[PDB]
Symmetry: D2
Subunit: 335 residues, 4 copies
Amino acid sequence: RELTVGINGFGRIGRLVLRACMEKGVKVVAVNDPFIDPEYMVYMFKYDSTHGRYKGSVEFRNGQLVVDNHEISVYQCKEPKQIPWRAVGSPYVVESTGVYLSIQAASDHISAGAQRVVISAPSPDAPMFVMGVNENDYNPGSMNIVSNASCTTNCLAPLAKVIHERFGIVEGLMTTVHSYTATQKTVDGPSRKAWRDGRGAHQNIIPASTGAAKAVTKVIPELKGKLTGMAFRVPTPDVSVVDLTCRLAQPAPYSAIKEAVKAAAKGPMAGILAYTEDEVVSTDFLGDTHSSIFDAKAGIALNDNFVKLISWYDNEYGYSHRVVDLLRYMFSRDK
Amino acid sequence: RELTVGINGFGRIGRLVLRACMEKGVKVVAVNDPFIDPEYMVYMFKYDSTHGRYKGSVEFRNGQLVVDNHEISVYQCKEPKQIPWRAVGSPYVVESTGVYLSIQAASDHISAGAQRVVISAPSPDAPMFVMGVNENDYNPGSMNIVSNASCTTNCLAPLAKVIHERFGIVEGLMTTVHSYTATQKTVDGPSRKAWRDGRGAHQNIIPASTGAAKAVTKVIPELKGKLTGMAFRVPTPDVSVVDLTCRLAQPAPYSAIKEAVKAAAKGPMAGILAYTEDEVVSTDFLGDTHSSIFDAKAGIALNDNFVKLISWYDNEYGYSHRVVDLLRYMFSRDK
Amino acid sequence: RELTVGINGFGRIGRLVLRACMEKGVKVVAVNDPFIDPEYMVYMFKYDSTHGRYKGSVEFRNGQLVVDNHEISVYQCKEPKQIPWRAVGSPYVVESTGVYLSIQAASDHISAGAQRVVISAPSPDAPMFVMGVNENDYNPGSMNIVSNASCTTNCLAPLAKVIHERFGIVEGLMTTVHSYTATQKTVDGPSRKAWRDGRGAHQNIIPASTGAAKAVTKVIPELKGKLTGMAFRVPTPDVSVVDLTCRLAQPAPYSAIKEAVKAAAKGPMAGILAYTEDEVVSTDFLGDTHSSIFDAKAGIALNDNFVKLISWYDNEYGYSHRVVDLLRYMFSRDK
Amino acid sequence: RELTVGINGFGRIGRLVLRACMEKGVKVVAVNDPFIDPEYMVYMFKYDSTHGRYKGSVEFRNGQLVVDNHEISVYQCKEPKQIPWRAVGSPYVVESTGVYLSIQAASDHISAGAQRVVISAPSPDAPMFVMGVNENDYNPGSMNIVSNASCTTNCLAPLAKVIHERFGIVEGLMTTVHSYTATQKTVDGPSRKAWRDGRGAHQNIIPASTGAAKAVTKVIPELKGKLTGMAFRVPTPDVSVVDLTCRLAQPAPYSAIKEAVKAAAKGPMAGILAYTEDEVVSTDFLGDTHSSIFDAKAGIALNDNFVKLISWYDNEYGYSHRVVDLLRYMFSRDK
Ligand SMILES: NC(=O)c1ccc[n+]([C@@H]2O[C@H](COP(=O)([O-])OP(=O)(O)OC[C@H]3O[C@@H](n4cnc5c(N)ncnc54)[C@H](O)[C@@H]3O)[C@@H](O)[C@H]2O)c1
Ligand SMILES: NC(=O)c1ccc[n+]([C@@H]2O[C@H](COP(=O)([O-])OP(=O)(O)OC[C@H]3O[C@@H](n4cnc5c(N)ncnc54)[C@H](O)[C@@H]3O)[C@@H](O)[C@H]2O)c1
Ligand SMILES: NC(=O)c1ccc[n+]([C@@H]2O[C@H](COP(=O)([O-])OP(=O)(O)OC[C@H]3O[C@@H](n4cnc5c(N)ncnc54)[C@H](O)[C@@H]3O)[C@@H](O)[C@H]2O)c1
Ligand SMILES: NC(=O)c1ccc[n+]([C@@H]2O[C@H](COP(=O)([O-])OP(=O)(O)OC[C@H]3O[C@@H](n4cnc5c(N)ncnc54)[C@H](O)[C@@H]3O)[C@@H](O)[C@H]2O)c1
């Protein structure tokens, strides 16, 4: 009858997905996190260093989290197979722990009673979607587990779609200047799988690998072989920026680029891709719900066919809203 | 014949204790850390965001860490009982993992072949020592496991000793404005045992409990019931400052306070307590080996009997040097 | 018939005083700042790194700043004597440049047409006020020029008043752990009058002198000779915290301290002094309009007569709201 | 007979140029700065938040700054014409105030007695030099006033030269992720000429214009029309990184790119361009004297003819050392 949502992992994304659900009237029926009990959940949800105090009521009772008088069941189980999703009636599940990324890992949610899973990160094998770019590729009859890609992919892909469709991208290389995240360390500590990521997050500019640019070629297949990139993690707690250097097939004077993006933002990519000519900086996008905000004045062209395009994204807040948008879209298709 | 040292936990303290050992000619025969293999140890030891590149050679071979041509065995075991300390001849062990704080937990090192253990943190029951204040209380014949207290206790106790012995402390309350540490989080995350400590370390001033002031009354028994305090964690990666507000029994004009501290620094507390009248800030003490650096100009008196005294400490580097000093002292007593 | 406000200095306080005026329905008729033209004022007012985008419309036309359709004259003169306050009909002027602090300096506003002046900083000779503590000492007949004291004094004085009147303060020493401000430097630079203040604000814990605690004894004369203190500037961009260590005459068990502050917050100091028992950190007070938020759990007592009390303040936002409250109060009295 | 140096502007570059002079045995005979007297110069030179305490003696007497027993005259004049350079016998002058960038402005140093001037910043008309790239274009007879370009240009040009001469650069776009500097603000403040630069430096990723990439085409004329770029200022106090995305004429497999850079670093560009394959982050280059350190592992190729190349630089320290190198080179040529 209605979209209902379960959240596994009540972290930055989990908690802000709940905020976005409340904002968009999406019913959340349960949250699972073995490291956060109901009373502690109230505290973590209510106070946020980055996005301020929750505007509304947050309480706990009867083993439940209660937000704006909406009662939410709280589970404390460590593995998807163990979560009693059936107890709250076959919800759509957001998998936002960061550690159950494969179809096999996520499918345990379905076994445990979930109707669908949205993995809030790229997956090695789950079908990947970026709202505004390829959500139409979703087939309810054949797909119960999907990925909403990464924050960076959701920033680049809408922009790349507009630029490629208007001018043709011959080749492009991306850099994201990216806020630090929960995977990083306060001071130099162990990060066996990726040594640089262990170094103090607040002290350093840290180069990092990312598949985000290549992932864009998954949701825009015409761009296979034509995009890749990397990241720098820097000492800001939220908001990131994509820096796309691309060679274009058709001449693209910068004024034409601006008109193409502005047209997309006003029309078919409204709410996903935005456009600004203001003298903005990263904090100006705290709480912004867009996937991608094109920065007209920040970019620079060498010539009509070789340009550097700049687009902002609140990697926490924009992405969380896209998770909710994908859920709502999936539900609209699954009737 | 000679002091030999094993380090359990190759973290901020573990690695800087190794630096201090190399600087002071103390032989380190082994390091244990299940999360850092020899090649990775080379990297973590060589590069440091806070204290710069190691000045010397760092290599690995034959399963060993080699620093300035000194070969160091590397073990990868998760529990003290499992570490083959016997294989490197009954070393003195630095327990710097942060999770084996009790006499019972640390005693497994002895069972595994260690001759002594120095816990690099306060212990609920191990005898506690602050160099320059009460190391004489150490008895080799009855004590195989000891604690070197905390960075903050090592800052406050030498100062409190000088002030109490000259003027008499009637009562005192301490605040430490303290750099963030590895126990904290880059962004708002779970900290069940202490909620505030979960909040983003780089964004916040964070109140925290600390037993450091009360611990001073353990090493200066005359001050039992007369000292306690608390902490603020702030967005700096290293160096902290003690803020001691105390009522004194004898009149203590600030000039007399300065002369007492200066006399102690030049004489019996040389190398432990230092004295400055310069316009210093926290970064000026990066790499400082003193336990406590009295800041003459920063303090303020209401009157001759009620004063606020300020003292700096490199919570990483000073403390690591005191660990080494305690080891050397213990060895000198144990012959 | 109505209060009208002119703002000299469109900085952090000037701009946030304008926000507070909009929030409280106070008519602002002019802003003077020689370094910010109308178009640039729009930008600086609309976007804020700390307090977010202005929720409303901001535009310029006809040499005026227009906020939520309210037309505001913009002047560009470098000295108070030169500002054409008469052109907007004898406004109450907020002096928030930071460089006209004396009665003599500020009085040039009056000669230029201002009805009254509120200096948004302590003054060497202008009478100082803290709302909720001594505004009733305002005398319209004789006080054309007043001072709203400092952010820190507005935090400490309400708390000091409650504690003194309930328990009697014998003596106290204050530390404020304080966010950096516009007077500080991004990297080590010149600060002739105060050397430590030149050192990089984002890298350092910086001791600083402040007259804030002594200033409390001016607005609460019964505390003359009983308070002083100092500051540490730390790497946060806004929100600060008072750390008051005091000796009390009457027995002051911490439970009794909490009931006294709670009662004050609910009654005579409502909207000025708040009370919390939550596990708060500095960012939880971004945008808070209170002068002082008592942190029950952060404080610690040595005994019934010697305690450390902790209270938060948004040094930008709370203080700006108090400027507006003082303006409104003065106006109601000048009738 | 010998090189003697005068420094105008005792800021980050002025002070670290003095450090580099001491390190390289270059005689500094005078420093001019109207905002820093001899006693204050001692303090600012001795203590450094970024690069640590000066390892040596620093004192003042007889109106002079004395470093390692070298007596340095201290002048306090506000304009180049007014500085008594003649009193110290026709020194080579480093113009590091940031406000005398043209040949016309800087030439007043010559009228005041200077032998030559090195502007420590790009100039609109003074010839620009990058050591290791085009110092041989220096012509003593006709060039009294020169520019050492920018920190960023000194990073990019050596790399661009190596890559162009080996593979041929068809076109390239540069981003520098750059530490904040003294021109920026601690909190949102006025920056009329460049609005984004006024926004809080420690809170924001800040896009900025830079002519650095185009400047490379001035010192490497064969690249005219083939390079431009932009900057992001981020919350680190020192060390920056160049991100060069270029299209290459000859096939440039990444292995061949590494051999070309490595060979340059070992030979013709030794001490200017370095090469590393370690997992480095920005703080690992604090105090590094190279203009450019190529980060082999950080870069990524889309294909053999389209690559992203990453190179580090200590924008303060490396550049200061290059100023000294240019002075010495000019002197050897003026003989
Ligand atoms: N923070 C961002 O900018 C961002 C943006 C897009 C996607 N993501 C992705 O979202 C996912 C979560 O990222 P995050 O930033 O919220 O990290 P996070 O650390 O803040 O949140 C992870 C949460 O999952 C909990 N958790 C850990 N193991 C669990 C388990 N077995 N079962 C249930 N809960 C568990 C943790 O207690 C924590 O609260 C990751 O895959 C991340 O890559 C993050
Ligand atoms: N950082 C400071 O300022 C400071 C000062 C004084 C004392 N201490 C104390 O020193 C101890 C370590 O602190 P830290 O800052 O170095 O933390 P840290 O996280 O940087 O180091 C801990 C190290 O121990 C390793 N480790 C974890 N579990 C282990 C296990 N079972 N066996 C072996 N190694 C293990 C970790 O891999 C890590 O390298 C703590 O008790 C701390 O309270 C810290
Ligand atoms: N920021 C705080 O936390 C805080 C709190 C309370 C009080 N104050 C005090 O308020 C006053 C301003 O502080 P601030 O933080 O807003 O500093 P600020 O630098 O942000 O604001 C100063 C403003 O005044 C402008 N200005 C400079 N000279 C001027 C002149 N002759 N005429 C007109 N305008 C001029 C500047 O362009 C700037 O916009 C200071 O006295 C400060 O001590 C600051
Ligand atoms: N800091 C860097 O990373 C870097 C690198 C390369 C080049 N530069 C350039 O070097 C120059 C200085 O940069 P900075 O970072 O040292 O800035 P800075 O603010 O730290 O130094 C400027 C110094 O010049 C002084 N000064 C100001 N006006 C003066 C005057 N008329 N006469 C004499 N002294 C005066 C100031 O007191 C200050 O000490 C600038 O042109 C800058 O673009 C900076």
